[PDB]
């Protein structure tokens, strides 16, 4: 878990390095994936030109940064297609919608065996609280693993937030861009250890796989997606949650949707609080301090 965050990045920008990277990823059970794309003038939904594809698997302690721009999409696809198409190797994503659209549109490939960890988290929230909101990476790492992320380089982040320039076109890439690019795939693989193969997780992995497959089918159609699967960008389709995860949950104490019994203020505020000694759990009439004859 802690070891994954210390994986160094290896830039893959030659045919020789690509063949070696493929060989490693071919022996994996799970591969975390992400993309860095050109920032657009529109700042649109559809990702710009693919610059990097980031990969980090369980087979080797390393983050591959595939320079798709240098290699070209044709070279990258020829060596990575069957790997991406192999359903026996799980492809991990954190919000896969735009990435899947980009892989379909720009690279001509639809990945198989996809698991979307953002959707996984929302599916847990649906099961327990009838909440269909998508949460950011920082929130999910905190909530699931207890970690607080460092946060990205601010000059890198400001350049992306401005969106007046491609940013990821420039070669060679400076180290603080390469480190920024490598960050999310480390976090994704780390999250999979907490969410996948864990009996305390109240949703089955196969159910989230099938829910993720609906996203992949919707977003990998060989062309730009006009109609979104979700009502707003920061939520998950409720009918899809109903179908693949089941009914939404709620508080077992007060009956309300939006929180669990462990978070319930009505439960905690409703407990007996001793007016004489202040302790929760008994009243003053049953207090041993106030009434030592009881002890
Ligand atoms: N405009 C938006 C707003 C949110 N989102 C998604 O919803 C998540 C939660 O965003 P908020 O932090 O705004 O709640 C983001 O991490 C992102 O995946 C999006 O993709 N587009
Ligand atoms: N943690 C929480 C959150 C909400 N609640 C209660 O649940 C009810 C409905 O919650 P919302 O206000 O989120 O809709 C309210 O009566 C609120 O006080 C609670 O008792 N504990
Ligand atoms: Mn992404
Ligand atoms: Mn990223
Ligand atoms: Zn409650
Ligand atoms: Zn007392």
CA angle centred on 34, ends 6 and 12, rounded to 5°: 70
Angle between helices 73-85 and 15-26 (to 10 degrees): 10
Q: Is 99 in the pocket of ligand 1 (CB under 6 A)?
A: no
Q: 131 near 122, Cβ under 8 Å?
A: yes
Are 105 and 97 spatial neighbours (Cβ–Cβ below 8 Å)? no
Experimental method: X-ray
Contact between 110 and 149 (Cβ < 8 Å)? no
User: Going by CA atoms, what residue is nearest to atom 20 of ligand 1?
Assistant: 233
Q: Distance between alpha carbon 247 and the CA centroid of its chain, in Å?
A: 23
Distance CA 79, CA 64 (A): 14
Contacts of 48 (CB under 8 A, 6+ apart): 37, 38, 39, 40, 166
Is the CB–ligand 1 distance for residue 234 below 6 Å? yes
Residues in the chain: 295
For ligand 4, the distance from its centroid to the CA atom of residue 45, given in whole angstroms, is 15
The residue behind tokens 């009502």 is 231
What's the CA gap between 67 and 12, in Å, rounded?
6
Please report which helix (H) or strand (E) contains residue 33, including its range. strand 30-37
Q: How far apart are CA 114 and CA 106, in angstroms?
A: 18
Ligand 2 atom 2: the closest Cα is on which residue?
A: 264
Give, using CA atoms, the residue closest to atom 4 of ligand 1.
Answer: 234
C-alpha distances out from residue 10 to 27, 28, 76, 161, Å: 18, 17, 16, 26
Q: How far apart are the first and last CA of the chain?
A: 50
277 is in an annotated binding site: yes
- Domain spanning 4-116+137-224: CATH 3.40.605.10: no
**Given resolution (angstroms):** 2.2
Ligand 5 center–CA 269 separation, angstroms: 11
What are the start and end residues of each CATH 3.30.420.10 domain in the chain?
Answer: 4-116+137-224
């Amino acid at each position: 878990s802690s070891m994954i965050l210390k994986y160094p990045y290896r830039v893959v920008d030659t045919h020789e390095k690509l063949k070696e990277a493929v060989t490693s990823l071919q022996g994996a059970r799970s591969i975390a994936l992400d993309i860095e794309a050109f920032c657009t003038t529109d700042q649109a939904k559809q990702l710009g030109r693919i610059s990097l594809v980031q990969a980090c698997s369980d087979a080797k302690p390393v983050v591959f940064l595939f320079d798709v721009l240098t290699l070209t999409p044709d070279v990258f696809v020829k060596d990575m297609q069957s790997l991406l198409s192999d359903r026996e190797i799980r492809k991990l994503f954190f919000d896969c919608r735009r990435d899947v659209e980009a892989l379909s549109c720009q690279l001509g490939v639809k990945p198989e065996g996809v698991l979307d960890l953002q959707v996984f988290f929302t599916a847990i929230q649906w099961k327990l609280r009838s909440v269909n909101r998508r949460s950011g990476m920082g929130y999910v790492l905190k909530s699931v693993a207890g970690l607080t992320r460092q946060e990205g380089d601010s000059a890198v982040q400001t350049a992306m937030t401005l969106g007046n320039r491609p940013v990821w076109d420039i070669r060679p890439l400076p180290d603080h861009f390469l480190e920024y690019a490598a960050g999310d795939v480390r976090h994704i693989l780390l999250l999979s250890n907490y969410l996948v193969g864990n009996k305390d997780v109240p949703v089955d992995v196969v159910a989230v796989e099938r829910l993720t497959a609906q996203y992949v089918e919707h977003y990998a159609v060989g062309k730009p997606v006009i109609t979104e699967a979700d009502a707003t960008p920061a939520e998950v389709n409720r009918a899809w949650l109903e179908r693949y995860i089941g009914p939404g949950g709620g508080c077992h104490f007060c009956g309300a949707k939006g929180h669990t019994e462990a978070e319930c203020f009505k439960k905690q505020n409703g407990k007996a609080k001793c007016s004489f000694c202040g302790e929760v759990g008994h009243t003053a009439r049953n207090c041993f301090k106030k009434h030592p004859q009881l002890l």
